[PDB]
Amino acid sequence: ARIKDVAQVAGVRSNQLVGYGLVSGLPGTGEANPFTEQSFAAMLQNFGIQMPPGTKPKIKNVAAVMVTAELPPFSKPGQQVDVTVSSIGSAKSLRGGTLLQTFLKGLDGQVYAVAQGNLVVSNPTVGLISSGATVEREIPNPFGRGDYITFNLLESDFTTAQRMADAVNNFLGPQMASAVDATSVRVRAPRDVSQRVAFLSAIENLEFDPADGAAKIIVNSRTGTIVVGKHVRLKPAAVTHGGMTVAITLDDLVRAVNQVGAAPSDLMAILQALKQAGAIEGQLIII
Amino acid sequence: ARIKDVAQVAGVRSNQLVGYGLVSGLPGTGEANPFTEQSFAAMLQNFGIQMPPGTKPKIKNVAAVMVTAELPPFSKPGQQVDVTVSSIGSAKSLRGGTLLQTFLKGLDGQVYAVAQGNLVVSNPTVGLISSGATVEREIPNPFGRGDYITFNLLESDFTTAQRMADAVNNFLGPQMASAVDATSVRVRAPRDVSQRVAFLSAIENLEFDPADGAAKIIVNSRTGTIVVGKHVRLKPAAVTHGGMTVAITLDDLVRAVNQVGAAPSDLMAILQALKQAGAIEGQLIII
Amino acid sequence: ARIKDVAQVAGVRSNQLVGYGLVSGLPGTGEANPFTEQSFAAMLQNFGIQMPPGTKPKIKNVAAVMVTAELPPFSKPGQQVDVTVSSIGSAKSLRGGTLLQTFLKGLDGQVYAVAQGNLVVSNPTVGLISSGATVEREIPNPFGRGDYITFNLLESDFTTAQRMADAVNNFLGPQMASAVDATSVRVRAPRDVSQRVAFLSAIENLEFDPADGAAKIIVNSRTGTIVVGKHVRLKPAAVTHGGMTVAITLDDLVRAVNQVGAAPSDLMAILQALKQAGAIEGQLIII
Amino acid sequence: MGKRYVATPQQSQWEMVVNTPLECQLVHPIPSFGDAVFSSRANKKINLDFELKMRRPMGETRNVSLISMPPPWRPGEHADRITNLKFFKQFDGYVGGQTAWGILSELEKGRYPTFSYQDWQSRDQRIEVALSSVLFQNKYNAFSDCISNLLKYSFEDIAFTILHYERQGDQLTKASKKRLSQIADYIRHNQDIDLVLVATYTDSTDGKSASQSLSERRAESLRDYFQSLGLPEDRIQVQGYGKRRPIADNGSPIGKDKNRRVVISLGRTQ
């Protein structure tokens, strides 16, 4: 696995932008909500048409939506990012709509992008635009600062952190990378920003073997799927479910489930009994 | 991949223009909204016909619309750009309409284009005009300033940025291009604007191989499609879904889905369990 | 069994983050609860739209939810974690929704993550997001402090604690690890944080045999499954159930159950009689 | 600015070109400049040659400065002046003795050995040539292993050999068999050896005809052995001189044993 596949550079982050806007050009599948009409009236005032107070627009092709964009790291003004458009009123469908000018604000309350474009919906009330938002401002980055760069593991593990440190040391030389915890690995990097990009290009393509990790059993209590990871061991026991008795991975337990009618989701309750009896060498996680 | 295919020049941007207008010549598929009638009355006053106050026009061939145009970089007065016309009232169809004179305003509130023309609609409430807007004003550009030009990658990556820098250096000579982050590459350029255009013409056609990028799994939660990118690796595990057990890309998991009735969209929930168990070497992205 | 499979490092803990948010883009399966409308109005005020007091939004695509995330140990800012989204009002379904910006608070009342994204629901009122929460703050750790590290057994046992101590001593040398109770094992570790990670990497992969543990019988009173562990012995006795008499693991008792009609869950009551007569060498646990 | 020739981390590669018990050759290609070759050869003494081989030959003899420059990705570390060499005209740069081992050591620490000098082909301007340490460790381990598995004798040490026979029998003594095994190893690993000259001759104890017969039988046994090593028959030469041409005083027990001997002389095509 390449380092870039299983890790991210510290300080090189994404940012989330959110804004309110109106979607027009709907085939009569718009809203009549008070906030939609209020926003529509304000927008019309912005163009020189001001209705008398208390006038009902009777609009049916306009829907109020919430626009969200994720700003990739090193985003420069003039670039385009995707936006997700979701209806917040009572519009039946956003299919075929057009997002009007909406300003996307950061967590500090400043506008960083402007979103327009045509919605592509499949849920008819959520659509996407491939280049809806144009980046208008930059977010500063700590990437070029300091005397080292840091890799953050996507899956935290002490062994994976140490193996990535060894991979860099073998490639470059001794005392070059060090694991500071189960997630972060610090690599000494050049001070020049151009040399650091060239340096990081060679390092992020290094190959190493991530560790297997702790043995876990993942149970989706609402879907019924049971994922048993590697290194999970079930201690032998006599399991009596329904009217039949079986002796002890899931293959034997699934057969015991199939013996009686019961249900494939009855296996989720057999594991909990095994966990209480100490017959599982691992972690039973319910998601 | 050519540089012009995978990158954009910094400072060479598009601009978005928006305006309000009326669409006439509709076969009785117009509006009766108060703002449509108000705008119609103001337009008629602009031609010497002023109805007494409180007069209802009873118009049925006029619809109020929002007109949007994108101004390409280096747009000169006299050029024509496309406009998207979307209905904002309650008109049933814009098919066969004619957009009347509408002024398109920039983000600074100034008029940069005037839009007219004939609508071509397929959604019957959104139409397009191939040369609707005529550019009337210029937007200044920083392209000819400075001692360098900058390329912004469409897909940000450290390796792609460095490979594009090497491509320029190999073509021209040493110390010519430098990658300053994962997105931007700076190339030294002539001071003369005519020589810079000739210089950029040779550079933007250079060929190089963009990097593969980080391994990702993209799941469209509303359509059901799952796109597994290159370099994604699934660690072996025992997955029990429904009543059958399978052992471990998607091909094996799709067969496990097809074993039981279930649904092709049940695979989206199997991946989340694998992600929780640490059996995915990559990023699971939900769009 | 590896040490990392059956034990956890003391001081290396997870943290639970909880927050309130709204889910938009629902196909008309939203709420009308007073708190949902109040939160929606406050959110709209945050964007410049303030409805007059007493205005009913009449929203149908918005649902109020509770967002929960678990913060893994050594979580750094910029990382992404899963979030579970559960409806708390009266929404019929959260399928196809979009979680709006919600702040996830710790047990001390401070915000440590921000959650957004697209919900993936199978129960239609609970959904999951694979990278919903972005970590924004760090929680300090006592991992690098002191002159030793401590392993906490997932299944507490004196023999397992001593065997893990012997496994470390055999690998490294005498007087290196010591069991302080049935759960914890203390291993002397380097003072340098980088050396401690390298040290812990070698130690957590050590293999040893966990002890069998106390003999137990686990009975699920609501499912009917009876899990009889190893080392459980039933003393011989004459059991008369229904109209037939049997003499004495579960196999004989299951046959006695099958003799009469009765039910497979009548075995749970036969064990309690055996427990009262002192015919069980073990613990009868009801879960 | 200046011309610096170094392999970037994406370009740096080390290779073990010759890996035999007679020679070791570790090669680092310096892009746009040439090669850097470390060579060790089977010998009784510690030997290493470093050769900076240039595509465009050295224009003039120049004083060269060898420094141990830290790589860019090591801020806060200073450069160590290693030494001053002389690169000669139309010859590859050569560093030998302890300095070549020091270059290998500075590469082991993760540093860049840099040769700086004024290039004649470059309008007499100062240029730098650096050896990259990227991807050096594994090939340095392989190089150390091959150096470990080097013969402890050279062609000069075995080219002339004199072996002795036992008092009774047609077999060589213990030490003579050991030396013959050494010769066989060197021959089997060296393909440049063309000629083998064998001159058996014995003591005066037996009769002249008997002496000649013994000497010829011994010569033929040695010729068959040398054939077994793979040399073609047209290369081996064997002659039995009997009890003639004594090198020691016949009559003394030690003298007769001295004369009971074979001469083996190798000849190579280097």
The answer to whether C206 contacts chain A (CB < 8 Å) is no
Structure-block tokens of residue A271: 């594991």
Q: What is the largest CA-CA distance in chain A?
A: 81
Selecting from D72, D136, D138 the residue whose C-beta is nearest the C-beta of A190 gives D72
**Per-residue DSSP letter, B52:** P
In angstroms, rounded to a whole number, what is the distance separating the alpha carbons of residues B41 and B38? Answer: 5
Contact indicator for A143, A11 with CB cutoff of 8 Å: yes
Give chains near D: 3+ CB pairs under 8 A: A
Residue of chain C with shortest Cα separation from B274: C130
Angle between helices A158-171 and A193-203 (to 10 degrees): 110
The token pair that represents D102 in the structure block: 């020091």
Chain C environment of B222 (Cβ under 8 Å): 96, 118
DSSP β-ladder status, B63-71 and B80-87: antiparallel
Spatial CB neighbours of B54, under 8 Å, sequence gap ≥ 6: none
Question: Residue written as tokens 């081992």?
Answer: D101
Residues 173-192 of B with CB under 8 A from A: 178-184
Chains touching chain B at 3 or more Cβ pairs under 8 angstroms? A, C
Strand D125-130 and strand D3-5: pairing? parallel
Beta strands at D193-201 and D112-119: parallel, antiparallel or unpaired: unpaired
Torsion of CA D49, D55, D61, D62, to 10 degrees: -80
Residues in chain D: 270
**Are the CB atoms for C126 and C139 separated by under 8 Å?**
no
Using the Cβ of B286 and the Cβ atoms of chain A, whether some distance falls under 8 Å is answered with: no
The one-letter code for the residue type at C117 is: G
Tokens 């929960």, residue? C68
Residue B275 in tokens: 């992600």
> What DSSP designation does B51 have?
P
DSSP letters spanning chain C: -BHHHHEEETT---EEEEEEEEEE--SS-----HHHHHHHHHHHHTTT--PPTT-----SS-EEEEEEEEE-TT--TT-EEEEEEEE-S--S--TT-EEEEEEEE-TTS-EEEEEEEE-B---TTEEEEEEEEEE-S----STT-SSEEEEEESS--HHHHHHHHHHHHHHT-TTSEEE-SSSEEEEE--SSHHHHHHHHHHHTT-B------S-EEEE-TTT--EEE-TT-EEPP-EEEETTEEEE--HHHHHHHHHHSSS-GGGHHHHHHHHHHTT-EESEEEE-
CB of C103 within 8 A of CB of C19? yes
Reference A264, options A219, A217, A216; nearest CA is: A219
In angstroms, the CA C131 to CA B284 distance is 8
Closest to A231 (Cβ–Cβ): which among C5, C228, C229? C5
Find the helix or strand (DSSP H, E) in which B241 lies: strand B238-241
Quick check: C81 and C139 in contact, CB under 8 A?
A: no
The answer to whether the CB of A252 falls within 8 A of the CB of A267 is: no
CA distances from B25 to A28, B28, B96, B130, C134 (A): 20, 8, 7, 18, 52
Contact B276 C120 (CB under 8 A): no
Q: Residue B85 forms beta bridges with which residues?
A: B67, B127
The CA distance from B60 to B80, in Å, is 30
Tokens of A72: 């990739």
B34: nearest Cα among B74, B66, B64, B4: B64
- Residues C266-286 as b/e (b if ≥16 CB within 10 A, e otherwise) read bbbebbeebeeeebbebebee
CA B278, CA C194: separation in Å to the nearest integer? 24
Give the residue among B134, B99, B104 at the shortest CA–CA distance from B119.
Answer: B99
Closest CA to B268 of A269, C93, A68, A220: A220
Are C12 and A182 within 8 A, CB to CB? yes
Task: Assess B272–C contact: CB distance below 8 Å, yes or no.
Answer: yes
Contact flag D75-A190 (C-beta cutoff 8 Å) = yes
> Three-state SS across C181-239?
CCCEEEEECCCCHHHHHHHHHHHCCCECCCCCCCCEEEECCCCCCEEECCCCEECCCEE
- Among partner residues D73, D108, D138, which is closest to A190 by beta-carbon distance? D73
Q: Which three-class secondary structure state does DSSP give residue B282?
A: coil
Q: Is B76 near chain C, with CB under 8 Å? A: no
C227: Cβ contacts below 8 Å, ≥ 6 apart:
A237, A238, A239, A240, A270, A273, A274, A276, A277, A279, C217, C218, C219
A156 touches C at CB < 8 Å: yes
DSSP B143: T
d(CA C29, CA D148): 77
Distances (CA, A) of A5 to B213, C189, D48: 8, 31, 42
CA distance linking residue D43 with residue D147, whole number of Å: 11
Technique of determination: cryo-EM
Residues 6+ apart with CB under 8 A from C263: C257
Q: Which amino acid is at D92?
A: D
**Can you read off the two tokens belonging to residue B183?**
């997105």
Residue B180: enclosing H or E segment and its boundaries? none
SS (H, E, C) chain A: CEHHHHEEECCCCCEEEEEEEEEECCCCCCCCCHHHHHHHHHHHHCCCCCCCCCCCCCCCCCEEEEEEEEECCCCCCCCEEEEEEEECCCCCCCCCCEEEEEEEECCCCCEEEEEEEECECCCCCEEEEEEEEEECCCCCCCCCCCCEEEEEECCCCHHHHHHHHHHHHHHCCCCCEEECCCCEEEEECCCCHHHHHHHHHHHCCCECCCCCCCCEEEECCCCCCEEECCCCEECCCEEEECCEEEECCHHHHHHHHHHCCCCHHHHHHHHHHHHHCCCEECEEEEC
Tokens of D224: 């068959």
**Kind and range of the H or E run holding B26:** none
Asked if A135 and A76 touch (Cβ cutoff 8 Å), the reply is: yes
Q: How far apart are CA D205 and CA D228, in angstroms?
A: 32
Q: How far apart are CA C230 and CA C283, in angstroms?
A: 12
Helix residue spans in chain B (DSSP H): 3-6, 34-45, 158-171, 193-203, 250-259, 267-276
Breaks following residues of chain A (C-to-N distance > 2.5 Å): 122, 248
Q: Which of B216, B217, B221, B225 to probe the C interface (max C CBs under 10 A)? A: B221
Residues of D in contact with A188 (CB under 8 A): 73-75
Q: Which of B51, B125, B129, B123 is nearest to B88 (CA)?
A: B125
How many angstroms separate the CA atoms of A12 and A279, rounded? 44
Tell me, in Å, the resolution of the deposited structure: 3.2
CA C3 to chain centre: 20
| Dist. CA B78–CA A205, nearest whole Å | 50
Touch test C–D: 3 Cβ pairs or more under 8 Å: no
Backbone phi and psi for residue C115, each to the nearest 5 degrees, phi listed first: -115, 130
Rounded to whole angstroms, how far apart are CA atoms A24 and B86? 6
Burial category of D262 from C-beta neighbours within 10 Å (exposed 0-12, middle 13-18, buried 19 and up) = buried
Task: Give Cα D12 to chain centroid, integer Å.
Answer: 27
Coil, strand, or helix at residue B3? helix
Token pair in block for residue D74: 């090591």
D10 part of contact set with chain A, CB < 8 Å: yes
Separation of alpha carbons D200 and D238, rounded Å: 8
Residues of A with CB below 8 A from C205's CB?
A: 159
A278 contacts chain C (CB < 8 A): yes
**Touching pair A, D by Cβ (3+ pairs < 8 Å):** yes
**Considering only alpha carbons, which residue of chain B is nearest residue A200?**
B158
User: Cα A152 vs. chain centroid, distance in angstroms?
Assistant: 16
- Of the candidates D14, D53, D8, D56, the residue with the CA atom closest to the CA atom of residue D35: D53
Q: Is B199 helix (H, G, I), strand (E, B) or coil?
A: helix
Q: How far apart are CA D30 and CA D130, in angstroms?
A: 8
CB D264 within 8 Å of CB D183:
yes
Give the other-Cβ count within 10 Å of A39's Cβ: 21
Q: Is B281 helix (H, G, I), strand (E, B) or coil?
A: strand
The backbone torsions φ and ψ at residue D147, rounded to the nearest 5 degrees and listed phi first, read: -60, -35
- Rounded to whole angstroms, the Cα distance separating D121 from D125 reads 9
> Does residue B219 contact residue B213 with C-beta atoms inside 8 Å?
no
DSSP string, D42-105: --SS---EEEEEESSPP-S-EEEEEEEEPPTT-TT---EEEEEEEEPTTS-EEEETHHHHHHHH
Name the residue with tokens 């160590």.
D80
**Tokens representing residue C132 in the block:** 């919903």
Distance CA A185, CA A179 (A): 4
Give the tokens for residue D168: 């009774």
The pair of structure tokens assigned to A241 is 């479910």
Angle between helices A193-203 and B158-171 (to 10 degrees): 110
Pairwise CB contact (< 8 Å): A227 & B274: yes
Cα of A276 to nearest chain B Cα, Å: 21
* Chain B contact for A118 (CB, 8 A cutoff): yes
C120, C122, C126, C131: best to mutate for the B interface, most B CBs within 10 A: C120
Chain A environment of B281 (Cβ under 8 Å):
1, 5-6, 210
Residue of A nearest to D110 (CA): A173
HSE, side-chain direction, 13 A CA sphere, residue D157 = 13
Amino acid at C178: S
Structure tokens of A46? 């912005």
